[PDB]
Design a protein around this ligand. Structure first.
Ligand SMILES: [Co+2]
Length: 9
């Protein structure tokens, strides 16, 4: 989750 969000942002 953390990873997904960092890249999305
Ligand atoms: Co983070």
């Amino acid at each position: 989750l953390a990873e997904a969000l960092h890249h999305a942002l």
